Design a protein around this ligand. Structure first.
Ligand SMILES: *[C@@H]1O[C@H](CO)[C@@H](O[C@@H]2O[C@H](CO)[C@@H](O[C@@H]3O[C@H](CO)[C@@H](O)[C@H](O[C@H]4O[C@H](CO)[C@@H](O)[C@H](O)[C@@H]4O)[C@@H]3O)[C@H](O)[C@H]2NC(C)=O)[C@H](O)[C@H]1NC(C)=O
Ligand SMILES: *[C@@H]1O[C@H](CO)[C@@H](O[C@@H]2O[C@H](CO)[C@@H](O)[C@H](O)[C@H]2NC(C)=O)[C@H](O)[C@H]1NC(C)=O
Ligand SMILES: *[C@@H]1O[C@H](CO)[C@@H](O[C@@H]2O[C@H](CO)[C@@H](O)[C@H](O)[C@H]2NC(C)=O)[C@H](O)[C@H]1NC(C)=O
Ligand SMILES: *[C@@H]1O[C@H](CO)[C@@H](O[C@@H]2O[C@H](CO)[C@@H](O)[C@H](O)[C@H]2NC(C)=O)[C@H](O)[C@H]1NC(C)=O
Ligand SMILES: *[C@@H]1O[C@H](CO)[C@@H](O[C@@H]2O[C@H](CO)[C@@H](O)[C@H](O)[C@H]2NC(C)=O)[C@H](O)[C@H]1NC(C)=O
Ligand SMILES: *[C@@H]1O[C@H](CO)[C@@H](O[C@@H]2O[C@H](CO)[C@@H](O)[C@H](O)[C@H]2NC(C)=O)[C@H](O)[C@H]1NC(C)=O
Ligand SMILES: *[C@@H]1O[C@H](CO)[C@@H](O[C@@H]2O[C@H](CO)[C@@H](O)[C@H](O)[C@H]2NC(C)=O)[C@H](O)[C@H]1NC(C)=O
Ligand SMILES: *[C@@H]1O[C@H](CO)[C@@H](O[C@@H]2O[C@H](CO)[C@@H](O)[C@H](O)[C@H]2NC(C)=O)[C@H](O)[C@H]1NC(C)=O
Ligand SMILES: *[C@@H]1O[C@H](CO)[C@@H](O[C@@H]2O[C@H](CO)[C@@H](O)[C@H](O)[C@H]2NC(C)=O)[C@H](O)[C@H]1NC(C)=O
Ligand SMILES: *[C@@H]1O[C@H](CO)[C@@H](O[C@@H]2O[C@H](CO)[C@@H](O)[C@H](O)[C@H]2NC(C)=O)[C@H](O)[C@H]1NC(C)=O
Ligand SMILES: *[C@@H]1O[C@H](CO)[C@@H](O)[C@H](O)[C@H]1NC(C)=O
Ligand SMILES: *[C@@H]1O[C@H](CO)[C@@H](O)[C@H](O)[C@H]1NC(C)=O
Ligand SMILES: *[C@@H]1O[C@H](CO)[C@@H](O)[C@H](O)[C@H]1NC(C)=O
Ligand SMILES: *[C@@H]1O[C@H](CO)[C@@H](O)[C@H](O)[C@H]1NC(C)=O
Ligand SMILES: *[C@@H]1O[C@H](CO)[C@@H](O)[C@H](O)[C@H]1NC(C)=O
Ligand SMILES: *[C@@H]1O[C@H](CO)[C@@H](O)[C@H](O)[C@H]1NC(C)=O
Ligand SMILES: *[C@@H]1O[C@H](CO)[C@@H](O)[C@H](O)[C@H]1NC(C)=O
Ligand SMILES: *[C@@H]1O[C@H](CO)[C@@H](O)[C@H](O)[C@H]1NC(C)=O
Ligand SMILES: *[C@@H]1O[C@H](CO)[C@@H](O)[C@H](O)[C@H]1NC(C)=O
Ligand SMILES: *[C@@H]1O[C@H](CO)[C@@H](O)[C@H](O)[C@H]1NC(C)=O
Ligand SMILES: *[C@@H]1O[C@H](CO)[C@@H](O)[C@H](O)[C@H]1NC(C)=O
Ligand SMILES: *[C@@H]1O[C@H](CO)[C@@H](O)[C@H](O)[C@H]1NC(C)=O
Ligand SMILES: *[C@@H]1O[C@H](CO)[C@@H](O)[C@H](O)[C@H]1NC(C)=O
Ligand SMILES: *[C@@H]1O[C@H](CO)[C@@H](O)[C@H](O)[C@H]1NC(C)=O
Ligand SMILES: *[C@@H]1O[C@H](CO)[C@@H](O)[C@H](O)[C@H]1NC(C)=O
Ligand SMILES: *[C@@H]1O[C@H](CO)[C@@H](O)[C@H](O)[C@H]1NC(C)=O
Ligand SMILES: *[C@@H]1O[C@H](CO)[C@@H](O)[C@H](O)[C@H]1NC(C)=O
Ligand SMILES: *[C@@H]1O[C@H](CO)[C@@H](O)[C@H](O)[C@H]1NC(C)=O
Ligand SMILES: *[C@@H]1O[C@H](CO)[C@@H](O)[C@H](O)[C@H]1NC(C)=O
Ligand SMILES: *[C@@H]1O[C@H](CO)[C@@H](O)[C@H](O)[C@H]1NC(C)=O
Ligand SMILES: *[C@@H]1O[C@H](CO)[C@@H](O)[C@H](O)[C@H]1NC(C)=O
Ligand SMILES: *[C@@H]1O[C@H](CO)[C@@H](O)[C@H](O)[C@H]1NC(C)=O
Ligand SMILES: *[C@@H]1O[C@H](CO)[C@@H](O)[C@H](O)[C@H]1NC(C)=O
Lengths: 123, 432, 120, 120, 120, 48, 48
């Protein structure tokens, strides 16, 4: 039982901003790296961003590299993504997912184990 | 897929033997030379750490023994050498008309003593205890003349057993055992680490241990080998037994010069009555105390085994009688009234006496002269433990002599380990 | 926690208290000799660590692969379910081998760096 | 100049004589104790400096921001209008805070480095 | 080989045994003084290497050019045809000059690095 | 070569009455004096 | 044959042999040793 639940999203006009968030339970939140994956209406799956388990290392796909921030709060069991300078090409369902990189002491994965249902973002 | 990763600062250790330094807050022990103290001796409980202890292989004990002997010798070294006193003495009885217990105990002797100038002698009278002199065939000598020179303890240096703490050098740590009912060996699961031990009072005694720690719950009986009669049994009590000792004689101390800046102190006379030294023990407390000891002894020997206590068997006074230093006098007491029973499933008085010529720690060849104490003496302490030995019954007798066992009874909770903060483990990274 | 507070915890958790341990390693003849010896010991560990290419780092990794014969008890098995005191016994007979390898796969690195810096 | 020659000058000028001062820090029982102590003192500073992530450097800097509560005194008009002896008193009540922060924002870096090197 | 085994070999060959020599530098008053001094000597060499910008390294090169006045002897003539004991005499009068240059062309580097890190 | 470096622009507080250099000199002088009398003839035979 | 200066007659010459020369020494007399206490813990041993 993994509970990854996305919120936020909605329709924002180009050049605007929004914040998505994902609350999570079941699994020790602080034990896993998490990512956001984009499902554009016709692309299916695009990786967007990755944050490590301590919230100190972040990685981005070039297309959002100068615009998006990925952040973590281990007391709240919350993953979030702050979007800025939105463009029409960013319309997609944004999924909260658990997986990707690991701690160097724990069997690195490089795959996603769990998925939320996805927040809808329309620009 | 895994690579060697090096970690420095890893919390591991090995058993080790090192030099500990002391700290405390003149005295025979050089407390003024031992003062890097710590007002905040922090203790860190180690959760989920189980360590094996062995109090019989604890080198902290051997160091404590050596440090005490060394301090004693240094402190009482720069004092008057009473070599001029190894002379023939002419003695009679101090109180020849006395019909009491003290009849014959104090001798009244004369000397031809040296003085400030080498050209003169002086006639001196002084009192001696019977145990300090030998008849040589009137015609007495001091007992030390048989083996050694004797030094007068400096009158300005106190024999009070001021607490000493032992602290680890950097790179080392001291671990407390802290389990209840810890019998001296094996895996305490309640281990904690400290920089420095609690203070230990260097109380020196035989037969019964005084002024030490108490067992937390029940009497604990410890031995290197409980079935080996060649070993001593150390018994730690969970309750104190109070003992009141006295020297009921008002003595007058006199002094003379025996050389160029040297003075000899001696027992001059007795004011009031002459009475025997003694110690008072609550009768009920003592009987309860042994009942507890027997109950615990039966755990090793059987609840259908008869256990009896008996009188010490022989040897010199340091092993046949109880001994201690109270007010500066050295007392020897007869414990035969305590160890007299047989257990099967008001006050007690120990007669005592004192002597001024003392051979400490079996150091034959170096005698000390204890100067007399002016006035009367009262000294109160508790018995916190005892030392026993062994002969369908078991016989237990008081033991003693080897002072290391007195210190084993305080240091049983500690061990010293060396910290080794470097190690490796597999991780998933390649440097570059 | 405090000094050795993590001794009973797992290797992973205890790896976060290395600073605490490091600061407590470094601060009449018998006592003076003990102080001199503590210094010599400290320096020997620092020298050794420096030889391996690991200088001021409390944690550093290298190019020596872990051999499966060196008690290769899985990975999460040791980092999450073992303490450092236990690990120190699991590989106690291999530390000299490992240390020799660490020194060797350093001297090789220094020569490679010296040659690369010589290219124009 | 020479040893402590810059003691009366500004922090700016004094920062250029660090080598001079460093070389004069490092070289019967009481005399021997003094020598042993000087070594222990020296090593403690080197250990501390190494823990902070600053090893073989006379000058280094880090990711701990300066707090305005720690004697906020401009920059350029103070750095070059103050001596080190004066500065030392201006922040004497904050050095323990600063030192603690310097260690924390190092242990974090070592963990981040170890994780990055683990990305295949 | 072993300690000093390479002493009669050429400089090139001997440069590969530096680890061996370094490990043999580290471990009643007269003897205790000898031990304290061995530590002070060791630390002075380590301090000097740190000042020159060469810390946890057995081999390191710098930005000080070799001056031909400092006993120029070709290049292969030295490395493949001379022992370190001979080289030590060839330039014995120049070591203080060289050391001074090594310290100066470090302080210049530390300042340049400090300024580059100040750019945003 | 007992080199001296003028500390230009340095002002510092001195207190000669709390200067422990004095105490060390005092103790060292007494100690040297006393050590020098150890390998010598005692005249206790003259106290006549 | 070793010397600091072999031409200086004031110096000693140390000669190292390549073969041992065996020497057998003795005190061919059965002596009896006696002892006397001469003080409180001191004893003198002598040829009796
Ligand atoms: C077990 O612990 C107890 C408790 O500490 C200990 O008994 C104590 O012994 C000390 C010293 O023998 C007693 O203190 C004395 O009290 C009298 C009271 O008037 C003082 O006069 C004494 O001072 C004289 O001696 C000093 C020595 O330097 C002189 O400096 C001073 O000027 C005086 O001449 C001294 O303070 C203390 O009262 C007892 N405590 C009790 C409860 O009796 C006991 O001795 C320990 N057991 C053993 C075997 O040591
Ligand atoms: C010290 O003097 C005593 C007294 O003469 C010597 O010991 C005695 O030896 C006889 C021999 O049978 C015993 O019966 C006595 O009981 C002994 N007396 C004591 C008090 O033990 C003793 O040997 C002398 N010490 C030395 C070193 O000679
Ligand atoms: C503990 O004491 C017992 C004695 O009760 C020791 O056992 C004896 O060991 C000797 C060794 O030669 C044997 O000859 C005896 O027969 C043993 N006694 C019994 C009853 O078996 C025992 O070895 C001691 N423990 C240790 C570790 O030495
Ligand atoms: C030990 O108990 C005895 C009693 O059995 C005490 O002796 C009495 O002491 C008072 C004190 O002046 C005397 O007046 C009594 O005459 C004594 N009685 C006897 C029978 O002698 C003794 O003092 C106690 N000793 C201690 C140290 O408390
Ligand atoms: C020890 O014995 C001597 C000798 O009897 C005692 O000294 C005598 O005391 C009486 C008492 O008045 C004097 O008249 C004598 O002249 C004393 N004799 C000498 C030689 O002085 C001496 O007091 C006894 N010691 C003690 C402490 O009682
Ligand atoms: C891992 O360790 C094993 C030994 O513990 C190494 O295998 C040995 O290699 C030597 C090379 O001459 C052989 O003679 C031994 O017989 C080998 N032992 C075994 C058990 O096969 C092995 O090479 C090491 N692996 C790596 C990658 O270094
Ligand atoms: C600068 O230091 C001050 C204190 O000197 C920090 O402010 C304190 O932060 C704690 C955190 O809960 C508060 O409880 C205190 O009341 C704060 N004190 C004051 C005076 O504000 C401040 O956060 C530090 N600033 C930075 C950037 O670290
Ligand atoms: C190499 O060293 C020589 C000296 O050993 C330097 O030459 C000297 O430079 C100073 C500079 O003022 C002149 O005053 C001397 O007269 C020069 N000496 C000679 C013999 O000409 C030389 O410049 C150094 N080379 C380099 C590249 O620095
Ligand atoms: C070895 O000893 C000889 C003999 O004394 C030294 O030679 C003498 O040196 C003095 C120096 O002025 C001359 O006056 C003598 O005439 C020399 N004597 C002879 C016989 O020539 C010789 O110098 C010593 N060697 C050393 C190295 O000191
Ligand atoms: C040293 O000379 C003395 C004196 O002549 C010898 O002692 C005498 O020996 C004879 C032999 O029976 C005795 O009868 C004498 O009584 C001894 N004299 C004394 C004073 O005791 C002595 O033996 C000689 N020493 C040796 C070692 O022969
Ligand atoms: C002191 O020496 C004299 C010398 O004759 C002697 O008569 C006297 O009895 C001696 N005194 C003592 C106490 O022995
Ligand atoms: C102390 O406990 C250990 C635990 O194994 C036991 O073996 C030992 O005999 C005990 N000591 C005594 C005196 O029984
Ligand atoms: C001992 O004698 C002195 C003599 O002055 C007296 O003051 C003191 O009170 C006496 N002590 C006792 C216990 O009687
Ligand atoms: C020791 O002295 C105290 C003083 O109050 C007394 O209460 C206690 O009973 C005495 N102990 C004995 C055994 O008499
Ligand atoms: C010791 O105490 C027990 C407690 O009941 C008692 O039965 C026993 O008789 C006492 N022993 C003596 C000698 O009084
Ligand atoms: C002694 O009493 C204890 C109490 O539990 C019992 O277990 C043990 O077996 C008894 N021993 C004997 C010899 O009866
Ligand atoms: C102690 O008193 C008993 C009672 O008979 C006696 O046998 C014993 O020898 C005495 N001990 C001493 C040391 O006098
Ligand atoms: C032991 O108790 C008995 C009981 O009468 C007594 O006769 C005997 O003398 C006592 N022994 C000692 C040493 O007190
Ligand atoms: C007697 O034991 C009690 C137990 O707490 C202790 O407080 C007291 O000080 C002891 N008596 C002496 C003289 O130490
Ligand atoms: C001790 O073990 C328990 C078992 O769950 C664990 O929770 C606890 O944290 C451990 N103690 C330490 C210091 O880790
Ligand atoms: C190695 O660790 C993984 C972690 O889940 C475990 O599943 C696997 O069974 C372990 N290997 C073996 C041989 O048990
Ligand atoms: C490893 O897991 C077992 C599972 O029961 C646990 O008991 C043990 O204490 C764990 N080890 C550590 C170091 O916590
Ligand atoms: C080390 O060698 C001994 C030799 O008997 C062996 O018992 C022990 O298990 C070995 N340790 C390791 C880590 O293999
Ligand atoms: C001392 O102060 C004056 C003021 O201008 C300055 O010029 C001089 O360089 C200062 N001395 C030092 C050593 O800085
Ligand atoms: C603060 O720094 C600025 C930088 O130009 C300077 O102008 C100002 O005077 C300084 N304020 C002071 C020293 O109070
Ligand atoms: C700072 O400027 C003031 C302005 O007069 C000057 O007096 C002071 O000496 C200067 N401080 C330093 C360290 O030069
Ligand atoms: C440090 O605290 C004391 C407390 O009185 C204060 O007087 C002093 O000025 C403080 N120092 C600094 C640098 O603020
Ligand atoms: C010694 O010189 C010979 C000359 O050919 C050379 O082969 C040999 O390797 C040299 N020895 C060493 C230790 O370099
Ligand atoms: C000096 O270097 C040149 C470079 O080609 C070389 O040919 C020449 O032989 C070298 N000199 C010596 C003595 O080897
Ligand atoms: C260098 O070459 C010369 C040529 O004769 C030779 O004699 C010398 O020994 C060589 N040096 C070394 C270190 O081998
Ligand atoms: C060093 O100077 C002396 C002075 O005479 C000279 O003989 C020697 O050759 C010089 N050494 C070098 C390496 O030039
Ligand atoms: C020792 O050998 C050296 C070798 O040069 C020689 O000069 C010296 O004269 C010799 N001395 C003796 C005494 O043979
Ligand atoms: C020396 O005399 C003793 C006397 O018993 C005798 O036993 C011993 O054999 C004699 N030794 C020689 C060498 O004659």
């Amino acid at each position: 039982e993994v509970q990854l639940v996305e919120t936020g999203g909605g329709l924002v006009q180009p050049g605007g901003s929004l914040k998505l968030s994902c609350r999570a339970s079941g699994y020790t939140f602080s034990s896993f790296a998490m990512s956001w994956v984009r499902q554009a209406p016709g692309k299916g799956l695009e990786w967007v961003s990755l944050i490590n388990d301590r919230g100190g290392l972040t990685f981005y796909v070039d297309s959002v590299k100068g615009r998006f921030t990925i952040s973590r709060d281990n007391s709240k069991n919350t993953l979030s993504l702050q979007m800025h300078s939105l463009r029409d090409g960013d319309t997609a369902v944004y999924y909260c997912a658990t997986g990707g990189m690991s701690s160097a002491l724990q069997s690195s994965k490089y795959y996603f184990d769990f998925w939320g249902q996805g927040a809808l973002v329309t620009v | 897929n895994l690579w060697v990763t090096v970690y420095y600062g890893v919390p591991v250790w090995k058993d080790a033997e090192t030099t500990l330094f002391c700290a405390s807050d003149h005295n025979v022990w050089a407390t003024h030379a031992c003062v890097p103290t710590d007002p905040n001796p922090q203790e860190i409980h180690l959760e989920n750490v189980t360590e094996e202890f062995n109090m019989w292989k604890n080198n902290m004990v051997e160091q404590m023994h050596e440090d005490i002997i060394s301090l004693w010798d240094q402190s009482l070294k720069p004092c008057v050498k009473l070599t001029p006193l190894c002379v023939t003495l002419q003695c009679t009885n101090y109180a020849p008309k006395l019909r009491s217990m003290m009849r014959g105990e104090i001798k009244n002797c004369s000397f031809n003593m040296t003085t400030e100038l080498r050209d003169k002698k002086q006639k001196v009278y002084s009192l001696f205890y019977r145990l300090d002199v030998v008849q040589i065939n009137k015609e007495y000598r001091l007992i030390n003349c048989n083996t050694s020179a004797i030094t007068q303890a400096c009158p300005k240096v106190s024999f009070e057993p001021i607490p000493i703490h032992y602290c680890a050098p950097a790179g080392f740590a001291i671990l407390k055992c802290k389990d209840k009912k810890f019998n001296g060996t094996g895996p305490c699961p309640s281990v904690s680490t400290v920089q420095c031990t609690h203070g230990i009072k260097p109380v020196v005694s035989t037969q019964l241990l005084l002024n030490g720690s108490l067992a937390e719950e029940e009497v604990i009986i410890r031995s290197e080998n409980i079935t080996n009669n060649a070993k001593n049994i150390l018994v730690q009590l969970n309750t104190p037994v109070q003992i009141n000792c006295t020297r009921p004689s008002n003595n007058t101390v006199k002094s003379i010069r025996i050389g160029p800046g040297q003075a000899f102190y001696y027992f001059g006379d007795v004011l009031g009555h002459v009475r025997m030294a003694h110690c008072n023990i609550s009768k009920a407390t003592w009987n309860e105390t042994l009942g507890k000891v027997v109950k615990q002894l039966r755990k090793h020997f059987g609840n259908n085994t008869i256990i009896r206590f008996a009188q010490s068997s022989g040897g010199d006074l340091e092993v046949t009688t109880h001994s201690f230093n109270c007010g500066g006098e050295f007392f020897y007491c007869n414990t035969s009234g305590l160890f007299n029973s047989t257990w099967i499933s008001d006050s007690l008085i120990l007669p005592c006496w004192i002597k001024q010529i003392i051979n400490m720690w079996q150091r034959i060849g170096q005698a000390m002269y204890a100067p007399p104490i002016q006035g009367v003496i009262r000294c109160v302490s508790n018995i916190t433990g005892l030392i026993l030995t062994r002969d369908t019954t078991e016989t237990f007798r008081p033991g003693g002599g080897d002072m290391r066992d007195n210190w084993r009874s305080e240091l049983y909770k500690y061990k010293v380990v060396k910290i080794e903060p470097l190690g490796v483990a597999p991780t998933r990274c390649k440097r570059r | 926690l405090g000094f050795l507070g993590a001794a009973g915890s797992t290797m992973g958790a205890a790896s976060m208290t290395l600073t605490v341990q490091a600061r407590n390693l470094l601060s009449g003849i018998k006592q003076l000799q003990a102080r001199v010896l503590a210094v010599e010991h400290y320096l020997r560990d620092q020298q050794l660590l420096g030889i391996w290419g690991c200088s001021g780092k409390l944690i550093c990794c290298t190019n020596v692969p872990w051999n499966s014969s060196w008690s290769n008890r899985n990975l999460s098995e040791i980092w999450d379910n073992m303490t450092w005191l236990q690990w120190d016994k699991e590989i106690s007979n291999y530390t000299q081998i490992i240390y020799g390898l660490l020194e060797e796969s350093q001297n090789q690195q220094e020569k490679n760096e010296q040659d690369l810096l010589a290219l124009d």
